[PDB]
Design a protein around this ligand. Structure first.
Ligand SMILES: O=c1ccn([C@@H]2O[C@H](COP(=O)(O)OP(=O)(O)O)[C@@H](O)[C@H]2O)c(=O)[nH]1
Ligand SMILES: O=c1ccn([C@@H]2O[C@H](COP(=O)(O)OP(=O)(O)O)[C@@H](O)[C@H]2O)c(=O)[nH]1
Ligand SMILES: O=c1ccn([C@@H]2O[C@H](COP(=O)(O)OP(=O)(O)O)[C@@H](O)[C@H]2O)c(=O)[nH]1
Ligand SMILES: OC[C@H]1O[C@](O)(CO)[C@@H](O)[C@@H]1O
Ligand SMILES: OC[C@H]1O[C@](O)(CO)[C@@H](O)[C@@H]1O
Ligand SMILES: OC[C@H]1O[C@](O)(CO)[C@@H](O)[C@@H]1O
Ligand SMILES: [K+]
Ligand SMILES: [K+]
Ligand SMILES: [K+]
Lengths: 791, 781, 163
């Protein structure tokens, strides 16, 4: 409680520090972020501030300032993952620190005004099993932590080793036996068997194939899965002997990663139009889709090599479960089963939504799918049962509906589970927790937040794309972190939602497919076949549903952006910033890609957003400096489009109020296009300001706009400046975001957590019942509440 | 015997789609077959121990109870043999299909408490059922034994212990086991040289210096004993020493008792619907609890004045009663008061009496109001909270939670066992009884409470052949609502059997002449023997000299009084041998209660149909315990008998009352009375499901006593002795207070693991009870 | 074994602290000062030390940030520059959080420790000339001379590197 002291500085700086604590009261009955809490009386103050001493502590890091009756409460975040909540009152003295459940009480009085036995969700009791890291370093590093604990627990405890034995003893695929046979009933014989094997094997030649000694092995109790040749079987036998004797983290991870485990993979991505063509840019259809497609291709390749290396011929299968939309014309979304491009074993598997009145045909927004998901789970269980040979080895959920379903599916089928958020709506729609009720009929946030909290704790491990997605930065709160303590007044109060230190978080950074996106400077690789099309797309004088307005001057650098068109993407905002700044309009041309104007739009935000764009063109008279391009569905041509922007020596700008990750940011950089990205969410981590690109603030756009004008201004003066950043980006990407290590990491995690799952089954039993009841008595009602779509 | 089982399994299939109990399963099956039985082998016992068999067309499911508390679930195809092991959840699937046509939703709620309670290891022995404090003592004893980290809780506890700002036990001076150690030895030498009887005022100055606050004892001798106990605990803990100490520390000062339903008062109530043994029990209880409470507070050298509040509902419009006043002193006590708070809604307070089955929508606000009202009355917060029955337990839990107080619960009955198949058939019963609400609260308070007090062993684990009241709540289902895979464990250490008794000043042997209250005889004579038929008593007894077959109780379906009348009505021999006297119902007013109203018609009709006039006297509710005691003794004078023909009886205070008076008793074998009476020794059991035999059995008793008068006196004596041994209020107060101490402390140690169970129950109350409760239609004035 | 016994057992970690706190040579205090009495302030200080150092230029000499260090309870021996002090501190933080064998060893090996060494070889004619081949005078003598020479180079090296 140190941060409740630096504020006691009222005794020193009083006649000043009770001013900023006033000019906040002069806002009233609300809450505001650092942007507001800070940029209020602090900057708007007078040199009678001179508060740059001890007090800048709490202001500089205070997440939200919530104004109320005489009392104002602050939320102060000294370090990522550590929270102290405080309230003093305005003019008056006596500022006392608040408990978490209590600070929320104060937030709820800000809306409803006052339900005693109204529910509290607390997960902290339900996990104390393994301890948790207090160290920044282990956030998103959880597997490294679990390893070290697992290593310790395993070290010379007879009983403690038995789990590992049973694991390898039961383990099997499609009825075929792998690793250890039923002959090994205890550590004694396993110790002995392994030893005899190493004897025999150490003697034979390096390249000797398993088939040779399979005879002997089968005799002594060893089935396949140890390796393809003797050299590899030896290594694996040693690894195990070593975990029996003196376990260590590097070994445990290595051995567990190596055991053949993952053959059938199930991936949930229900909402949106999920396809390989004619989709991207549509509502709800975006980076999650791209990510899963690159993901399975990579995953397949790694799986194949692992299987081969371990002495198995098994055929892997990966299914992406999504929804069957029979009426989406010009897409493949109507076909049950579809092969993923450039894979032997990866298939999209489509299953329809239905009610007792039969299947539901029309596309439904991701916010409205809730009522449909439980039946989807049942039906998908059945379909994936048909296609799969054996059961799922790994289930990965995606986003809220995907995570909701994958939890149900994994409980049902008893399979290791992973979740990937891809975004968390609560950070994208500010104060949508406190203000949820008035948003519900439109966004139904009550169901989503529930599905999120549900899946988050239900899953075995969680993958994130950045550190920021978990704990954010030193200044700002993380995406998951913001779920630790929050309330939805009138519904329930989440006292501990999730813990930024939970050993289950793992950061595995995706990448962009390198055959699609490469440096604009490799001429041999450029796709020139596309230049006619692109010349038309950017520079033609025809205005239509494909593109709006016109570029008068074809030689200017292009300021480029591409995205789904919804309010958070903020494309309209950028269009405004550009509109108002005359120096920038002078230097560059604006080209925005988003929304599909070929068809009438069924999405609320999209529709709204098209209205603003239409207006803004008229307001700022954008014709001749602006080109508004409709959704571009082909990634291949997209790669060449990015590179083309490079030829003009332009930039990529991503002006989102919040961006959970931002693949377009990764894409642009990969092509060598200097990128200005929003500082809210993932791109804050992706880009190193000044080195691999620049940050801008969607909340100060007029500044964003003039920053861009500075950049272009510098490059005209010193063209090497453009090249400097281009290279910075190219490097950042090579260093951080690439698909190669991804799959290896993912498979290894599945191995570790899979075994962990079996040791720790006994203490998660309570949390399982807790979560069962939450879903049953909280989710199901909220979902049934949601209006059905009408065909 | 592969050719045989296929047969009984056929006979059992012929009964079709249903469940059958052992009363039927094997009752029809085994004997009703051919001489092919030859069953004295192993497969016989399996059936013989089967509690119920649920039969569907291809399969039959079997719940098998080898020993109390021990269940196996199996399925068998009625052809092809192939017995198959079954999980509790899978066996329950069967019940759900049997009713709704299909199992409950794939993702519909399964309540499972097993993973929660598991903090402490389960006793496997019959002996520890009902004996849980004994087990928790051996556990704490061990956990405490030479463990630094484990002794700290006892220090912390004793250090924070206070009442109303007056510090107790250890002061803030003692920060560690070392100074506590040193100080206790220092304190030991000092008190060793002093005269036994030296008062705590003398060495009080000394103790304060070394950090010892008040409550160790009233005199030196007592402070000495206690300090030595603690030394032992710090040194070599053992179960007896641990308990004794924990029971000695002054703890209970304020006590809050929850009993919201019925007309709860000291006069003019008993026999009113919902008003019965629970009221009697609580009144006798507070009285005795106060005595012991004063006793202990004095002994530990404290001056605090106790308070005991019985929270019940304010009924403004009940006339002739005191149920309309907010505060009432309990007769024969200094500190016990009834505290009434009204039911209310947004619309304002609700006046009319409401049945126990209907109160649910009111219970939450009641709690809030109650809290506010007992905050005004009590000095300090409650040191103990006792829930009573379902609505009382429900409210006792919410209060305990709100105020952070040690919670005990007493069921007094569990409806699921009173209304057979009311779990599986719950849906069609709900508009009337609202069992979805009730069962929900039962399960909820059962687990939410710190400890549980029962009046019999049978109330927990039943008997060897039959299931127990709680035991029946372990696995059950309510098709369409939710499934309870593990709801309670008969071996749970929180169970404690503490038997209540009959007030000894009100009930005693009929043979003590000095004590008989003769001033009543004039009244009683008119009551039993007068020629007047009115709302007070119906029909008339023709021969005043016959022995009287006597029963008295609340009048409802389960008390089965209309049953007894019919049995007696059919049987001529019984009728000649004695007169039937039934006390039940208050016919002075119009009956506002469903069962009672219907039960009255049944009664009236029987009277006509069996020509009961001259053998039968139907008396209205006798609301005064004092005269009632004498009424009992009068039945004795005639050399009659008490009979209690309930279909199920949770405990049976009447049975106790009868026996205490020396009146030979025949009671139902279904529920508590089965344990209370020892057939042929303390009285006799009858089976309410075979009435004509119950009757014949009675006729036999009377025929015997006529040929051998001293046979009446044998059973009389046997009843008296049985009571002297098992049911009396004396020890009750000690046990209850001790328990509150042991469990109070365990609270602080085990707190880590009840945090999980606490959040589980919070969600269950919030998302399950509330919605159910609110669904119940509100009363209208 | 240590790596495992050291994982989140407080009663286990204290010894490491006592070690570093009592550790001194020739009247000069090393590693942790007496101002650090428990794992709590140890964890606090180390963290406070990390944040600060993370900002300084890699080759910054211990002398610069020494003043600050002495305040928060840190004495000499962590390293000669900021880079080396950074790692050493990061390692220790690790042993407190998630102990692993590589870390445990690497750290215990880095703590400046061996300064004075006593070697026992009583029998034989032990000298650097006119001896080898005499009775009892043999490889042991040859071994030991080679050893100390090698050992001295390392000890100087390690003393220098730890500042
Ligand atoms: O009209 C469009 C809009 C979207 N994209 C692609 O969609 C993805 C968007 O991912 P991002 O994470 O940047 O935004 P999200 O949709 O996930 O919120 C990127 O691969 C874009 O190249 C596209 O190809 N054409
Ligand atoms: O008309 C009546 C009916 C009941 N009782 C008393 O109510 C209690 C009934 O308790 P028991 O446990 O036998 O039955 P319960 O009503 O609790 O189900 C006994 O003290 C009876 O003497 C009474 O005094 N008058
Ligand atoms: O006349 C001699 C004999 C021995 N040596 C040296 O003494 C050592 C003998 O060591 P070794 O381990 O071979 O045998 P040890 O004497 O230890 O038994 C070797 O360095 C020899 O070169 C020598 O220098 N001159
Ligand atoms: O919330 C952003 C949306 O875009 C996606 O990436 C899909 O393209 C999903 O994560 C989500 O539907
Ligand atoms: O269920 C039996 C009924 O009788 C009582 O004992 C009170 O007389 C209550 O517990 C309940 O209302
Ligand atoms: O046995 C070997 C002998 O030679 C030595 O190496 C000394 O040169 C000693 O170890 C021992 O005296
Ligand atoms: K196997
Ligand atoms: K105390
Ligand atoms: K030191």
């Amino acid at each position: 409680r140190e941060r409740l002291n630096e504020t006691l500085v009222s005794e020193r700086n009083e006649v000043l520090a009770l001013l900023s604590r006033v000019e906040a009261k002069g806002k009233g009955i609300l809450q505001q972020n650092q942007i507001i809490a800070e940029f209020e009386a602090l900057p708007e103050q007078t040199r009678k501030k001179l508060e740059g001493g001890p007090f800048f502590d709490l202001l500089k890091s205070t997440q939200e300032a919530i104004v109320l009756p005489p009392w104002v409460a602050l939320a102060v975040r000294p370090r990522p993952g550590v929270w102290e909540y405080l309230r003093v009152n305005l003019h008056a003295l006596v500022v006392e620190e608040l408990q978490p459940a209590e600070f929320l009480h104060f937030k709820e009085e800000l809306v409803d005004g006052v339900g005693n036995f109204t529910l509290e969700l607390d997960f902290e009791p339900f996990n104390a099993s393994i301890p948790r890291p207090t160290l920044h370093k282990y956030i998103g590093n959880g597997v490294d932590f679990l390893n070290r604990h697992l290593s310790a627990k395993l070290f010379h405890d007879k009983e403690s080793l038995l789990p590992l034995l049973k694991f390898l003893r039961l383990h099997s695929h499609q009825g075929k036996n792998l690793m250890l046979s039923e002959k090994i009933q205890n550590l004694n014989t396993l110790q002995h068997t392994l030893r005899k094997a190493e004897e025999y094997l150490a003697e034979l030649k390096s390249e000797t194939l398993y088939e040779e000694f399979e005879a002997k092995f089968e005799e002594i109790g060893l089935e396949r899965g140890w390796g393809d040749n003797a050299e590899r079987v030896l290594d694996m036998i040693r690894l195990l002997l070593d975990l029996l004797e003196a376990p260590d983290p590097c070994t445990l991870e290595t051995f567990l990663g190596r055991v053949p485990m993952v053959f059938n993979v199930v991936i949930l991505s229900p909402h949106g139009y999920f396809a390989q063509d004619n989709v991207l840019g549509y509502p709800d259809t975006g980076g999650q889709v791209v990510y899963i497609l690159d993901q399975v291709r990579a995953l397949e390749i790694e799986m194949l090599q692992r299987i081969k290396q371990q002495g198995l011929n098994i055929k892997p299968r990966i299914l992406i479960l999504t929804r069957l939309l029979p009426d989406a014309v010009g897409t493949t979304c109507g076909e049950r089963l579809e092969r993923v491009y450039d894979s032997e074993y990866c298939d999209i598997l489509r299953v329809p939504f239905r009610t007792e009145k039969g299947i539901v045909r029309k596309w439904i927004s991701r916010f409205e799918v809730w009522p449909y998901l439980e039946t989807y789970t049942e039906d998908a269980a059945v379909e994936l049962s048909k296609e799969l040979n054996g059961k799922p080895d790994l289930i990965i959920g995606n986003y809220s509906d995907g995570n909701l379903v994958a939890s149900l599916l994994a409980h049902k089928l008893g399979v290791t589970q992973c979740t990937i958020a891809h975004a968390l709506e609560k950070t994208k729609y500010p104060d949508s927790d406190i203000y949820w009720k008035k948003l519900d009929d439109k966004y139904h946030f009550s169901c989503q937040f529930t599905a999120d909290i549900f899946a988050m704790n239900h899953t075995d491990f969680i993958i994130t794309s950045t550190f920021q997605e978990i704990a954010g930065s030193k200044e700002t709160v993380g995406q998951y972190e913001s779920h630790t303590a929050f309330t939805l007044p009138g519904l329930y109060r989440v006292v501990h939602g999730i813990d930024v230190f939970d050993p289950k978080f793992n950061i595995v950074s995706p990448g962009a497919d390198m055959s699609i996106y490469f440096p604009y400077t490799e001429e041999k690789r450029r796709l020139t076949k596309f230049h006619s099309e692109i010349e038309e797309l950017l520079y033609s004088d025809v205005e239509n549903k494909e593109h709006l307005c016109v570029l008068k001057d074809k030689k200017k650098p292009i300021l480029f952006t591409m995205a789904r068109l919804d309010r958070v993407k903020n494309l309209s905002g950028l269009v405004e910033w550009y509109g108002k700044n005359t120096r920038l309009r002078e230097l560059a041309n604006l080209v925005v890609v988003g929304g599909d104007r070929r068809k009438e739009s069924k999405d609320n935000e999209e529709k709204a957003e098209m209205k603003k764009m239409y207006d803004l063109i008229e307001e700022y008279k954008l014709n001749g400096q602006f080109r508004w391009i409709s959704s571009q569905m082909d990634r291949v041509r997209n790669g060449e489009l990015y590179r083309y922007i490079c030829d003009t020596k332009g930039a990529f700008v991503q002006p989102a109020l919040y961006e959970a990750f931002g693949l377009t940011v990764v894409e642009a950089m990969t092509c060598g296009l200097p990128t200005f990205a929003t500082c809210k969410g993932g791109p804050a981590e992706i880009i190193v300001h000044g080195k691999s690109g620049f940050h801008i603030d969607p909340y100060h756009g007029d500044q964003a706009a003039d920053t861009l004008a500075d950049f272009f201004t510098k490059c005209k003066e010193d063209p090497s400046h453009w090249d400097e950043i281009s290279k910075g980006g190219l490097q950042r990407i090579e260093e951080k975001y690439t698909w190669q290590i991804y799959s290896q990491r993912l498979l290894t995690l599945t191995g570790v957590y899979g075994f962990w799952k079996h040791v720790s089954n006994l203490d998660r039993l309570e949390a399982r019942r807790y979560l069962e009841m939450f879903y049953a008595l909280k989710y199901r009602p909220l979902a049934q509440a949601v209006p059905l779509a009408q065909d």
